[PDB]
Design a protein around this ligand. Structure first.
Ligand SMILES: *[C]/[C]=[C]/N1=C2[C]=C([C])C([C])=[C]C2=N([C][C]([O])[C]([O])[C]([O])[C]OP([O])(=O)OP([O])(=O)O[C][C]2O[C](N3[C]=NC4=C3N=[C]N=C4[N])[C]([O])[C]2[O])C2=C1C(=O)[N]C(=O)[N]2
Ligand SMILES: C[C@@]1(S(=O)(=O)O)CC(=O)c2ccccc2C1=O
Ligand SMILES: C[C@@]1(S(=O)(=O)O)CC(=O)c2ccccc2C1=O
Lengths: 979, 973
């Protein structure tokens, strides 16, 4: 019944449009021709849209000319509709951007808004801006709204209210405030992050409050826009708190997104909350702007995708939630925000059927698109408000790209109506019918040998209240477990020595976490003897059975995820996210290497001659020494040890002194898995006492080492000698340092480059082999890149990692703090200090977040690995010099480049020869399988952990060849070359 | 045709209207019936019968029964009770095919067969002939037999015929008829030494033939495997001409050989030319599976037809040709196939052939109804009657069982639609060919296949070596320069390279590189590197393919050089060049496979590509013992992966090293990518290894040198970009275990070859043979007796088994080791060597050796074999594992349990079961080991090229402004 009224409503709407197409679908216009070809040809769509994205950085004639050729080819190979060419492209693109923007200045915006009023349209005004990356940028954004409100304040008294059916003639349609603005919450705080939930809410709330107060001063409306899922809960809480501070002021709105599976509950909770507090609210319901982003993000982190994934589900959710809002019109004002005629028709007929007062609902569209839809709304619904952004053409271009993406999406109602000539009946169909049909249809990777395929363990997800509450609880629990003595673990038994070294909290060294027994050469010898005695039965254990112990250890760790993470926060000063990621990576190694050994464990027939069977397979070596670092104390230890173990070797394991308790987690995990005695032995000890003894020992066949170049090179040299009694040439697996650079090209997206560089340099205090310690910045973008990087750095806070508000904290120990501070002083004498953060007073191994510019390849801090929060900034005269400078060290571990030049990226792929090169993202945080990690030169020996070549380094191949012919007869085998 | 066929079909039906292994009432019938239904059981049963005569104790027998047939419960029903059940039954099955175990019994049973109307041709069962003494025993057994037959035949009444001499069989056939297996007369019969093999066999055959003629008897020369077919034909041709007036000499021809149409034509034309008479016994052929396997293993044309009806058609076609020529050629039809027999009978009638020009033969013990029928229908039937020891009687039994129960066997199919069975095989051929008419490469290239091995059954291959050796001798005396950056560079320091079998013969002079020239070569390689690294992997691979084709065209020439410069035997030389070709073909394909970047991970909004980069300059330090193969393997591997090479050949094989220069030059390899710098190790050895611009060292040679290189290269010098990657292959002290149940006819010649092939100068050579207590005396006597039959001398003469060792230095060192071993153990054999010049070390076998001894531990790299006596199989395994090396190993055993224990515990890089432990081929046997034998790299296999490269990953964030392209393999929605 209602559905039939909605369809006929939509039918009249299509009738009233008279076949008119929006400008983007007008094939008589240039933008229409461009979009037509983009919709026909996916490669051109990618070229064109990415070109419009980079366009605002093409600020010189050479940049512009080259990018045009790189994106679109030579003039002859362009489409017909496509230096003169610079002018025609520039003009058409600028014209498309102005289509969606009401002005570049406040004054121009105001004049144009008044034009729109005379044409019958209300407005909600938005300020365009690049991403806020600093406090000063947040202040500029805030002050622009204050400037806007002051201009509107002077003008609104002279505006006649838009015609209504009843109400107050001074107000739009008799009821709506004439001044309506919308603000993006994250633009008010550059470090908005649910990891610091309370801090983010407060920072945003404080600025929103200042804007709101001036909105209330002119009796205006403020809408709080909704952004990506990461900030949704923060944004809802900002709205709730501001609303309660001004419980009597009715003109405050929030956006809710119907594409979120969360939205049914979020809407219900918010209405119930409003009822409880006896307040009213306003909701602008949208479908949602970040669909592709949320799906990609969730898939990259193994989170549940937070959006519906069939487009009709979002439409059905919209009509469902709109009805809920309309039914609650008493407490909830409604803004329908959609360009979809079915959606709009649904809302109109539901409001009519529910007899909702017209002052409780209005319709909104984006300025400059769906033109015939906009005009149709005005005619049939009367009350229509245009979302009108204004400001700088740089963010204006990014906004344009997102509009073009939305208009030309395969699933777009506008594309289907105006490009594809879709049937009206199908366009106006009840989306619930659509959902069932596509759900039904959609009910129409694999693993091996009964095991699911490998997938990286889900990352900690601080959008969840339970994950946010888990860390303080588990840290507190860890604090009840302090003061213990950790013994050696040899041959399944605890062995105590009388040489104890305390392990302490680097953010609070007076806090002793425990006491670690130290192995002398006697005990190391016993560990080696136990591993050697366990080796024959372990080597003879079926590879599938050995893999099963890794799977059990992974499950044991998975059950203790937050607990194991909390130990790292305290013992080595990992931030919450850094600690959890260390534990998930350890789990990833276990799951991945288990699967790799199953794959590699089956002998393969090689060759195809009949009368003959050759089988090629692998054997372990013997006893492996595993010398692990403190910086990834569970992940890398577990990676090296489990690789050696699963391949059939037995392990003597020396954790780093300062993370010996984390090393004890390996004992716990392998013991819980029931690993046979002697296969894993835990022998922390003083390197000065037993370091060479372990490396030199005749019964060691393999050494896995991750650490400094000086130590790795020394081990490589010593391990090469063959001693009396020594059965094998020692196999060395050695990951050493990096002096990693990120290149910032002329056309880089600085909104992305700046925070990725800051995190690459200063995440975990710079204590990563992969960390960015050199940022090489192209001459023409240097001053503006540096200003933003430094201003963002200034917003960050340095302090204890157990407090999630801190960006980074103390370094590993007193020795590290002193070494790093000396490097900083050296660096300040080579270049010039750009930023040196405050650090907390009192105890703790704090090193300031430090940025030093004027650095050149000749300088020590351009060459030597500091392993701390010291970033060198280097000014390259051109891209050729940037590459040459990137390649000027003896290391080749990681590297990064931010660039949107196809030629520069191609050059970097080929010539920037690091083990792991990253394009347009941070150069840290390698994941198992996705980014197998390791390099050559002085960074290592070409082994890549977490990759499909890794396990072979811990084994040697064997071939068994059998002559199967007896008495002139051989069995035929399946793959035989025969007749 | 339809007329003749109709008569043939009708004659076939006559036979049918007119067999113990198919009798399911008897035990052998049941066992065979289950074999024909269950292939796993067939294999177990036939292999058990094969090993059975070696099961000489109660323990061996009991354990083998359980290992072959399982727990006496999971056994099929029809089968210490189980010990005696099998023993009596198997012995009974073997007796059905043998006319006696002694000459006296044979003769008496042969006389019984005569009174039953059957003629006979007598054959002497024997194990393989592995020595002159064994060849003499075999020969004298025939002489003993003939002597016994000579005294009986006058008393024999001729089988009744239609006319003629009543003192002759059927009126015309000699009453005494014997068959001899030619290779049983010479243990080293080998077409590689064609003339020597013909002469050795002919001399014994002549001795037998003279006694045959004295009795007015018939001698048939049997035909064996394809390897010896040409030798056997020539023996027949020579003996025939020596006694051109004596008509009773026959030869066997095999209709399953594609060669046979021409061989029969050739033989008939030969006989007409020489105006002699001949006799042919035409058979289908006994070695079908063997020839097919052997040809496929060596990449030779399969010499046999491979559709069974093709052999049947060939037989009828060739029988017709013989019968057309009945004037000059007597015919013996030898088939148990009723279609085949009926065809011969109607063809003989169609061509009006007199009955004294053809007869029918079957094997004693089978086709009894056929034999029953033949006698009634054809009247002239001769039984091929073997006699002798039960041991080779058992091997013969296995082969009889195999023939009877084959799917394609006329007998199995008959015991069935008669019209199908009696069909003209020509019709069957067309149908089957049509039905067949109704391994892939990659990127347009054929799949990898090992290069065809030299094939001395061919006259042209036998002629190629003396010819190419002569041509090489016209090119001696040259001075060989360095090759650096595409230019020849002369130095003043020259070292002669000489022939080790004849040191007065100087092959040329080799320029030596000083450190300055070595530095220049490294500099050239370094300068060439960037552009070579940036060359497309498919393009780099194309150069290897061009080099391989260049070598392929020079195969005999390249082989001849090795015969002279390092003393390779003909086969050893050719194999060295084919292996070089294999590496080129294989590594070219491996780089193409590895050359494409692969996406890793499946997360959307992201692309990770994983791929490989070369390292830089590689130093290649090559051995003399495989001077083209291993050199080319190491160098082409480094080159194809994008590195540039500085190559040091061994001093004494520097001319072979120069061949790498010629081959890469012919391929058009860019300058600097390959540089040739022979030099004195004391001058530039450490300089090369230590140089900071070297990123990889590929070495094959002694443990001592290899360990020194590993140690030195593990230092990183100032300006050194990388940790040096070491690819080092070092020695072996390789054992072959000879188990109680080993087949000694196989074990003996394989051990001899493994130990003394190329004078024992192989890293894979057998230098320890570990022999089980109960079979020790027996194995050692046969091994020593075979050794005694071999000759030591120049490798250019193919009559020699092995020759001089590499140089003066090697001879001295090996002789010191021989003396050490003689004090440690006891000499079992020590060959003569030629007098005069040449670096000759005797073929030396020493017994009494234990793991504690120096020659049980240290690599001698020469013709010195230690024989070690193990008390049980567990000790054999322990002793095999008692050295510091782990390169190759072998085991001769037919015990599933012992073989399984060896597969698990005999932990060498390449373990060989029931064959020699040398001769690894590319892809089939990737070669190399760990322990003190190497660093775990295997040349010629799928893990090898990665050792010359390092992986890189490029990771791209593909999302811009909220959108990322969907890629094919994305995890999506
Ligand atoms: C700053 C911001 C602002 N906002 C807004 C405001 C206004 C006034 C408006 C109008 C809007 C807005 N936004 C945006 C939105 O969201 C958009 O636009 C929408 O969504 C569009 O839609 P419509 O128009 O209704 O259309 P269509 O075509 O219908 O639809 C589309 C949609 O859907 C979805 N999807 C796709 N695909 C898919 C889906 N789902 C599921 N599945 C699948 N496959 C999406 O959503 C699209 O879009 C906004 C705002 C805020 O604040 N926030 C947000 O988020 N947004
Ligand atoms: C994220 C969006 S965008 O259009 O995709 O750029 C959402 C939106 O509707 C908007 C409207 C006006 C200005 C900016 C935006 C956005 O930031
Ligand atoms: C090689 C053969 S065997 O039967 O296959 O063993 C050929 C043959 O038919 C034969 C007949 C009588 C005695 C011995 C043999 C063989 O050695």
């Amino acid at each position: 019944e209602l559905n039939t009224k909605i369809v006929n409503r939509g039918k009249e709407f299509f009738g009233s449009i008279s076949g008119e197409k929006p400008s983007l679908f007008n094939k008589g216009a240039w933008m229409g021709k461009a979009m037509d070809w983009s919709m026909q040809n996916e490669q051109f769509k990618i070229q064109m849209f990415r070109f419009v994205d980079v366009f605002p950085s093409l600020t010189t004639s050479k940049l512009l000319t080259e990018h045009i050729r790189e994106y679109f080819g030579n003039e002859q190979d362009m489409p017909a509709f496509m230096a003169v060419l610079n002018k025609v492209l520039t003009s058409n693109i600028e014209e498309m951007a102005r289509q969606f923007i009401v002005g570049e200045t406040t004054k121009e915006a105001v004049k144009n808004l008044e034009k729109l009023r005379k044409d019958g349209f209300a407005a909600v005004v938005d300020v365009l801006g690049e991403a806020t990356l600093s406090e000063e940028e947040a202040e500029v954004y805030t002050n622009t709204y204050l400037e806007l409100l002051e201009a509107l304040k002077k003008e609104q008294g002279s505006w006649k209210g838009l015609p209504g059916k009843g109400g107050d003639p001074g107000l739009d349609w008799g009821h709506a405030p004439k001044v309506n603005i919308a603000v993006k919450p994250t633009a008010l705080f550059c470090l908005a992050n649910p990891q610091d939930f309370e801090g983010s809410v407060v920072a945003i709330l404080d600025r929103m409050r200042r804007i709101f107060k001036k909105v209330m001063e002119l009796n205006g409306f403020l809408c709080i826009d909704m952004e990506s899922y990461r900030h949704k809960e923060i944004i809802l809480e900002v709205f709730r708190r501001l609303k309660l501070e001004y419980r009597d002021y009715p003109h405050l709105g929030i956006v809710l997104q119907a594409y979120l599976k969360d939205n049914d509950k979020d809407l219900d909770d918010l209405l119930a909350w409003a009822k409880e507090h006896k307040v009213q609210i306003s909701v602008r319901l949208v479908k949602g702007a970040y669909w592709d982003y949320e799906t990609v993000k969730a898939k990259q982190n193994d989170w549940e995708v937070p959006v519906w994934t069939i487009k009709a589900e979002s439409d059905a959710a919209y009509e469902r939630q709109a009805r809920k809002i309309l039914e609650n019109h008493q407490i909830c004002h409604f803004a329908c925000a959609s360009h979809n005629i079915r959606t709009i028709s649904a809302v109109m007929e539901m409001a009519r059927e529910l007899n909702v007062p017209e002052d409780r609902y209005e319709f909104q569209v984006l300025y400059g698109m769906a033109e015939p839809v906009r005009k149709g709304i005005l005619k049939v619904a009367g009350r229509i408000r245009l979302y009108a952004p204004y400001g700088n053409m740089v963010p204006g271009m990014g906004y344009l790209v997102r509009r073009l993406l939305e208009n030309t999406a395969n699933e777009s109602f506008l594309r289907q109506s105006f490009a594809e000539d879709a049937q009206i009946e199908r366009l106006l169909e009840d989306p619930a019918v659509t959902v069932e049909r596509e759900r039904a249809a959609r009910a129409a990777r694999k693993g091996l040998g009964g095991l699911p395929p490998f997938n990286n363990e889900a990352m900690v997800d601080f959008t969840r209240a339970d994950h946010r509450a888990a860390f303080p609880k588990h840290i507190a629990q860890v604090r009840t477990q302090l003061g213990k003595t950790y013994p050696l673990f040899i041959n399944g038994k605890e062995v105590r020595t009388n040489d104890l070294i305390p392990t302490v909290n680097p953010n609070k060294p007076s806090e002793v976490l425990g006491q670690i027994c130290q192995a002398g050469t006697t005990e190391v010898g016993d560990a080696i003897a136990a591993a050697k005695a366990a080796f024959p039965a372990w080597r003879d254990t079926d590879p599938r059975t050995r893999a099963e112990y890794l799977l059990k250890a992974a499950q044991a760790a998975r059950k203790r995820l937050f607990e194991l993470s909390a130990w790292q926060v305290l013992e080595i000063g990992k931030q919450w996210d850094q600690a959890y990621a260390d534990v998930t990576e350890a789990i990833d190694f276990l799951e991945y290497y288990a699967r790799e050994m199953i794959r590699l464990g089956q002998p393969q027939r090689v060759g195809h001659a009949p009368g003959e069977l050759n089988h090629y397979f692998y054997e372990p070596k013997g006893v492996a020494a595993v010398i692990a670092p403190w910086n990834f104390p569970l992940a890398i230890s577990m990676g090296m040890a489990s690789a050696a173990i699963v391949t059939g070797n037995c392990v003597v394991f020396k954790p780093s002194g300062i993370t010996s308790i984390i090393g004890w987690h390996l004992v716990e995990l392998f013991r819980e898995a029931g690993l046979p005695e002697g296969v894993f032995n835990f022998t922390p000890g003083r390197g000065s006492v037993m370091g060479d003894y372990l490396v030199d020992h005749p019964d060691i066949s393999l050494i896995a080492f991750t650490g400094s170049m000086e130590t790795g090179l020394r081990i490589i040299e010593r391990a090469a000698k063959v001693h009396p009694g020594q059965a094998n040439v020692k196999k060395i697996i050695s990951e050493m340092g990096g002096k990693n650079a990120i290149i910032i090209d002329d056309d880089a997206d600085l909104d992305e480059a700046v925070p990725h560089v800051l995190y690459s340099a200063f995440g975990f205090q710079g204590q990563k082999c992969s960390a960015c310690s050199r940022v090489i910045v192209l001459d023409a973008v240097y001053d503006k890149f540096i200003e933003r990087l430094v201003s963002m750095a200034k917003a960050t806070k340095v302090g204890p990692s157990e407090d999630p508000a801190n960006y980074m904290g103390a370094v590993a120990d007193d020795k590290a703090m002193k070494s790093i501070k000396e490097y900083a002083e050296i660096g300040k004498r080579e270049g010039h200090v750009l930023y040196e953060s405050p650090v907390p007073a009192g105890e703790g191994y704090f090193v300031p977040m430090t940025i030093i510019g004027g650095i050149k390849p000749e300088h020590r801090i351009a060459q030597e690995e500091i392993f701390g929060p010291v970033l060198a900034v280097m000014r390259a005269k051109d891209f050729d010099q940037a590459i040459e400078w990137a390649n000027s060290t003896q290391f080749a571990l990681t590297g990064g480049i931010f660039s949107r030049s196809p030629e520069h990226l191609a050059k970097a792929r080929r010539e920037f020869r690091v083990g792991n090169l990253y394009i347009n993202r941070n150069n840290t945080g390698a994941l198992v399988e996705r980014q197998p990690f390791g390099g050559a030169r002085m960074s290592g020996v070409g082994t890549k952990a977490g990759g499909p070549d890794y396990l072979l380094h811990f084994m040697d191949p064997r071939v068994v060849t059998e002559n199967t012919m007896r008495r002139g007869f051989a069995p035929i085998e399946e793959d035989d070359d025969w007749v």
